[PDB]
Amino acid sequence: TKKAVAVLKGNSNVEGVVTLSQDDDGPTTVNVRITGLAPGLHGFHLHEYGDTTNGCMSTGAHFNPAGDLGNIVANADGVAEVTLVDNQIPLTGPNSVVGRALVVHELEDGRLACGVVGLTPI
Amino acid sequence: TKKAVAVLKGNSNVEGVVTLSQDDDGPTTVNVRITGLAPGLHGFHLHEYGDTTNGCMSTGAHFNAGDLGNIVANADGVAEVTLVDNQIPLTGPNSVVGRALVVHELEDDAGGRLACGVVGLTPI
Ligand SMILES: [Zn+2]
Ligand SMILES: [Zn+2]
């Protein structure tokens, strides 16, 4: 019943799209497609601020109302495509992640790419 | 007591930064700095979706009020201005957080969507 999207870019080759969906206070479904990554595990995190005025560093710290989505895996071609299901990522209420940032890291759980979490049509 | 920011980019030379600040449910202060504009008036709008998957077109329609009016680019293509608007909430059901700010090719009704950015949270 509620949806969000983040377009990831940064000072690097890495880019992609993340779509988030949640019904009520239920679990949040995260659909990840990120390209240009070095093969292997990459930390993938909610960060506190949807502030990209200074690249990905201006998004501040790992976000804790939880914010740890774990690793995503890039394949031999630098593509990470995966669907995660997380309970600690609300799109509504006081702890909404709307307007915050999604950040993908150089190393496993160095901010290669990020995007503001924005509203998108239901 | 609450703040947001949008970094504007698009399929054009236009880019820049907009900060928003609001105490309580009072008036919203909007600081604008956009560069690479043609000299003259440019429509400056809230649009409904912070969705840039299809460039600025995916931000959907102007959203309400959501008409911030015009900004003025100077001879060097720079538009640097502070606006005060009462209908741009940063809290509550109508919050514009996670929506989009869009700067237009033409003066406010507006032609091409030159640049846009998602409205995101920023500290303090
Ligand atoms: Zn992180
Ligand atoms: Zn518009």
Q: What is the DSSP string of B29-50?
A: EEEEEEESPPSEEEEEEEES--
In A63-77, which positions are buried (b, 16+ CB within 10 angstroms) versus exposed (e)?
beeebebebbebeee
Check residue A48 and give left, alpha or beta (phi > 0: left; psi -120 to 50: alpha): alpha
A4, A51, A119 ranked by CB distance to B122: nearest: A51
CA of B56 to the centre of ligand 2 (A): 10
Tell me the resolution in Å: 2.2
Would you give the DSSP letter of residue A88?
S
Helix (H, G, I), strand (E, B) or coil at A15: strand
| A interface with B, Cβ–Cβ below 8 Å | 4-5, 7, 17, 48-53, 60, 98-101, 115-121
* Ramachandran angles phi, psi of B27, nearest 5°: -70, 145
The reply, when asked if residue A42 is annotated as ligand binding, is no
The contacts found for B23-28 with CB under 8 angstroms, 24 or more apart, are B25/B89, B25/B91, B25/B92, B27/B84, B27/B85, B27/B86, B28/B84, B28/B85, B28/B86, B28/B87, B28/B88, B28/B89, B28/B90
Contact A53 B17 (CB under 8 A): yes
Q: What method did the depositors use to determine the structure?
A: X-ray
**What domains can be seen in chain B, in order of their start residue?**
1-124 (2.60.40.200)
Chain B environment of A93 (Cβ under 8 Å): none
